Design a protein around this ligand. Structure first.
Ligand code: SRM
Ligand code: SF4
Ligand SMILES: [Cl-]
Length: 546
């Protein structure tokens, strides 16, 4: 019985999305940008290019101005499509030189109305970009060793790596090599250009890459016999049907990582479902097959050998975000700063690149939690840096809230969203800071808040202390507005799991601060000593949670 799987012989398209990939190599659309589209403009762009093949090059069309959630749906595309683009720049590892960061700044100030926002996958995204300047931009990014290749599309998304790869004192190893090997080997190459859906990778020495929710994850663990290598995890995801990735129970050494990554992706290519668009993510295959069959197939058909068994890394009790100052293997310091919901500007990035030059620093990393850290600051030139960054509003000593808050793009730019998230976040933070500085000392433990535009969970709705899922709501049977559902007490690391939903409960855009304030206060009210938020939630009564 057919599910669209290549490996079972069913190579026949069953989607419009699968249909468009059978029409040449999607990535081939780059000639057409430079040759045709950047020269003729938005309206020349064939619609199967604009909506399909543009994705393989980091170009999603942004939402047209002044259409609220009322208008959100597959059937309003012509209306919702603004003649501008969100261009996503691929940063495998968050890793960047100061020259590279510089370029990202000026590209934004110049081409993207100063918009630059750090994604929770270590990328930057621009908005207000026009096709005319795409060729100029590619040309420019190349100078600094950056591309947009497969930053969107049915292909491997950015590979996450630790913001502190190679300098962290706690890391099991530095797997940067493996990342760069994967990118050098495999990005832009025909073999993995066509996958049932998107494909997300995390590789790190630390559990600081939200690994449990990636399609494939490689995580430092000491093997008692074989030494520092990587633990392999597979089948994660969070959209509208969240599933934690699971241990394959294998241990992979650094050098074999890119080989084993290619294996896994290969299994996705061939056995992944291609009938339903909503059922195409690897996770669904893993759910169906079970972990053991997966490993069986993986060894027997693609690696041609068993993967050496190995232990799980010991799950951390607290997420590792790298905000703040820390000593390096260097003998130097690194600096983690927090913007609000990843929101920086073209100006900020350049202004930052310059402060780095002042410090002698040439290494910066973006963070899987929309943050950025500067590396190799010597003690001597550190305070003059921090003050330089605080000046741009990039706080290295942020508050509880500013530090542990994410938002997606939402209805500001995103054509799929029901609510405003990012701008909303720029104001909610000060409101919470001054509203709850009151209770602040009594919180010995952080509260994480993720504001999501719609159910897609781009800012990780399910795995926050307080998670907000943007749905359309009714207001006295007069008219439908924007609003959020709450998911509470979801965490990664030790005993990972998702936040609970509440029965008949909605939070309008205005009420966000009200709800947070209340449930936080009720937390402190009913909590026990040392008890984390998430722990309370599981025993808490419905009423204290509303
Ligand atoms: C920018 C970012 C949010 C952020 O502020 O961090 C983001 C924003 C978008 N995501 Fe994503 N996603 C981002 C991380 C994720 C994550 C989180 C993660 O990877 O940890 C998820 C959840 C995890 C997962 O994938 O399971 C996520 C699940 C989605 C979904 C759900 C897809 C699905 O599997 O069903 C969509 C829609 C889709 O693919 O059909 C999607 C679609 C989008 C689009 C392209 C909306 C669209 O299709 O038109 C958003 C960009 C619109 C815009 O104009 O900004 N994105 N999105 C993140 C981009 C990181 C990157 O560089 O790649
Ligand atoms: S979670 Fe939804 S609204 Fe937010 S950025 Fe993703 S697709 Fe857009
Ligand atoms: Cl995405």
């Amino acid at each position: 019985r057919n599910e669209g799987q290549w490996a079972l012989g069913h190579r026949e398209p069953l989607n419009a999305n699968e249909e468009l990939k059978k029409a040449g190599n999607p990535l081939d659309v780059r000639e057409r940008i430079e040759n045709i589209y950047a020269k003729q403009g938005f309206d020349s762009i064939d619609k199967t290019d604009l909506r399909g093949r543009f994705r393989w090059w980091g170009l999603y069309t942004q939402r047209e101005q002044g259409y609220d959630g009322t208008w959100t749906g597959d059937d309003n595309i012509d209306k919702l499509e603004a003649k501008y683009f969100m261009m996503r720049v691929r940063c495998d590892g968050g890793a960047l030189s100061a020259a590279a960061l510089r370029t990202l700044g000026q590209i934004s100030t110049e081409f993207a109305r100063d918009t630059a926002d750090i994604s929770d996958r270590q990328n930057v995204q621009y908005h207000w970009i026009e096709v005319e300047n795409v060729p100029e931009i590619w040309r420019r990014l190349d100078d600094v060793g950056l591309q947009t290749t497969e930053a969107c599309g049915d292909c491997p998304r950015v590979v996450l790596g630790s913001p502190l790869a190679g300098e962290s004192l706690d890391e099991v190893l530095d797997p940067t090599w493996a990342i760069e090997e994967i990118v050098r080997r495999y990005i832009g190459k025909p073999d993995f250009a066509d996958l049932p859906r998107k494909y997300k990778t995390a590789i790190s020495g630390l559990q600081d890459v939200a690994h449990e929710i990636n399609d494939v994850a490689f995580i430092g663990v000491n093997h008692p016999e074989h030494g520092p290598g990587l633990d392999l995890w597979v089948g994660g995801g969070l959209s509208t049907n969240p599933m934690l990735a699971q241990r394959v129970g294998a241990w992979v050494p650094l050098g074999e990582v890119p080989e084993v990554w290619a294996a896994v992706t290969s299994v996705f290519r061939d056995y992944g479902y291609r009938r339903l668009r909503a059922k195409a993510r690897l996770k669904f295959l893993i759910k169906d097959w079970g972990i053991a069959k997966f490993r069986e197939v993986l060894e027997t058909e693609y690696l041609k050998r068993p993967l050496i068994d190995g232990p799980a890394p010991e799950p951390v009790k607290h997420p590792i975000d790298h905000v703040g100052v820390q000593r390096l293997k260097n003998g130097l310091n690194a600096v983690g700063v927090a913007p609000i919901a990843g929101r920086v500007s073209g100006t900020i990035l350049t202004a930052v690149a310059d402060l780095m030059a002042r410090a002698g620093s040439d290494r910066i990393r973006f963070t899987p939690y929309q943050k950025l850290v500067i590396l190799d600051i010597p003690d001597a030139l550190l305070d003059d840096l921090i003050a330089g960054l605080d000046a741009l509003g990039l706080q290295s000593r942020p508050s509880h809230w500013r530090r542990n808050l994410m938002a997606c793009s939402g209805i500001e730019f995103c054509k799929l969203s029901f609510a405003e998230t990012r701008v909303r976040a720029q104001h909610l933070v000060p409101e919470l800071e001054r509203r709850l500085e009151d209770i602040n000392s009594q919180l010995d433990v952080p509260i994480t808040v993720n504001i999501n535009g719609c159910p897609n969970s781009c800012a990780r709705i399910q795995i926050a202390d307080i998670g907000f899922k943007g749905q359309m709501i009714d207001d006295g049977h007069g008219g439908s507005v924007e609003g959020f559902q709450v998911h509470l007490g979801g965490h990664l690391g030790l005993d990972a799991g998702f936040g609970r939903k509440l029965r008949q409960h909605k939070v309008t855009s205005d009420e966000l601060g009200d709800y947070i304030d209340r449930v936080v206060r009720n937390f402190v009210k009913h909590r026990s000593e040392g008890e984390r938020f998430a722990q309370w939630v599981i025993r808490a009564e419905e009423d204290d949670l509303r």
